[PDB]
Amino acid sequence: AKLHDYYKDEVVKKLMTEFNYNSVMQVPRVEKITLNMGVGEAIADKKLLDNAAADLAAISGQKPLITKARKSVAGFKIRQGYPIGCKVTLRGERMWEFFERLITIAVPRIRDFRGLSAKSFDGRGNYSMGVREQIIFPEIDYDKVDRVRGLDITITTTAKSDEEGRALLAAFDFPFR
């Protein structure tokens, strides 16, 4: 919410002045943040998914979509349709809340945070960063932790290119080493 208002006025203002745009609609929004945990050990510990799911539920307040193996992959000993992961999509007020929480609490709390990347865009201005420790998030109690499973995060933006993606994120004060 707070970070959304900060966008709507200050970041939209600076982005318009920076890109020389004719329409406010032509500035990057953000679609969603999809938090993914490709557990891949559920085949070993079926329970380990409900515990990992319990953690995305913890970090972001949505029950997670427990996703299944799209097709059979024998190398990883997984068939088609087995629940080898769990994800959440955060969009809207809730996405803005989580985004604020991340940037203001967890991105500093990473182990000796030497910085984030600046190339982790698909090629149209959609960021994708992966965190190596679940503990960085405040929500975790460590009173209910099995292991130190990290996760990744995709900031899906309506941006046109990687330049607009970087512009939008840096505008939000992303560390961006």
Add this chain to the structure above:
Amino acid sequence: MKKDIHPKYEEITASCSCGNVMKIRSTVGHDLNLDVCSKCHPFFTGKQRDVATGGRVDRFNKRFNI
């Protein structure tokens, strides 16, 4: 969103040691009081400037004898 499947998501205050206190509607369960923040962090405001209040100070500076 749906009901009776999502955790509790009330409004919680998180206060860091440098005076950065942030209001965030979050899912923790009770008040929070953290140490680092997006402000009181080296790489976030001053990467070659910042100060700390821990193993670089308590453990060493408090006992320092120079």
Add this chain to the structure above:
Amino acid sequence: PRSLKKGPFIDLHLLKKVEKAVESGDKKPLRTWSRRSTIFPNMIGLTIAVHNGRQHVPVFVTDEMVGHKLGEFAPTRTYRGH
């Protein structure tokens, strides 16, 4: 651990080297043999390479290892397994 009435310890040559590094240093790691020296908060951000017995293993100095000595991060006894 070393008494407080004597404070911490660091070899004088190493101290001179690290203070040179944090006063005008942008060049090269510090190849030292003083495994017995307590880390300073000055060297935080340095890449001292401390003698493990046969070589010098580089160690990027982090502010979570302050009251620690240069020999906690150099291993002396390699052991694959039985």
Add this chain to the structure above:
Amino acid sequence: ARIAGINIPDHKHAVIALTSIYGVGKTRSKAILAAAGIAEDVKISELSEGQIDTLRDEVAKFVVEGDLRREISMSIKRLMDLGCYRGLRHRRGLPVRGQRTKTNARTRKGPRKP
């Protein structure tokens, strides 16, 4: 009889029961009952409710189960994230402070493998 989140036993004298808190041994138990003025020759049975309550907030003046677990586990985790010698020892599952491993390392090595 419900201090700190645990189920401190009755029929034990004051100290003998208060030892049960993960963070409260004999000395800290005597100190808790000292600040609480509670005699150590009585159980946690015949203590009025207010006695249990003052014991509660003095136990909370001290450190308790969840926070002790968290602090010591995070100390160990800081060690093993630091990657120091003691971190390596905790990782590998070997004696940490320099004890004997050729023989007599069992409480820290597990029972005998082959």
Add this chain to the structure above:
Amino acid sequence: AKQSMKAREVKRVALADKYFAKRAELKAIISDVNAASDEDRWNAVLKLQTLPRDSSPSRQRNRCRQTGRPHGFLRKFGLSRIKVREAAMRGEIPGLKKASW
């Protein structure tokens, strides 16, 4: 004792008893509590450690006075158990005898 080791211990006693009264005052200053501990102790520690290591009395092994033997030493007689028994049975050690009580 290899001769070199003997000469080592000779030079070690020599440098210890030479650099004495300097190492000792530095130790007193470090063990001391006063002088605000700012430059007194934090400079005495440095000066002490930079004093040549040979100057410490903690590098004397107390070898046998004759055979340079590191182990089995007795300070009283200054000789290993071997040379002690040798001279004590020959009779070169005064007042010494096989006790039996």
Add this chain to the structure above:
RNA sequence: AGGGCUACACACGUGCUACAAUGGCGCAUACAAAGAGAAGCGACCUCGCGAGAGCAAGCGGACCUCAUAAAGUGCGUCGUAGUCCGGAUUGGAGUCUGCAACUCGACUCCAUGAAGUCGGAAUCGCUAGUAAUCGUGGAUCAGAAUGCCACGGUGAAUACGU
């Protein structure tokens, strides 16, 4: 100069510590012997929960110190628990020696409180101030013993016989 002799899937010897009530724990009070000391023992008093620290007399020693013996005895608690047994681990904070205690010192305080329920085949020591238990000193020693060498306190059972 640093490291290793301290490395650890393992197996054996010799010991220490237990697994408890003939005990643990608090309080109160007894009774030793033999030693060692000067680049040493270090009163006292005071500070510190403690390790210890400051101060510092005395003593080359039947004089001073190390040095308060313990088990014991009285008083209570525990009530047979993996426990108020056990004190291994591990964390945190220190003290002392030494230039320096990370690999790799010893102690101290707090908390953490594992194995362990008297131990298979087999195997060991001891015929009396002995075994068994309790404690103290030395040498080596800057610091570093559960080892070794000494010393005392209680103090048994049994030996038909070959």
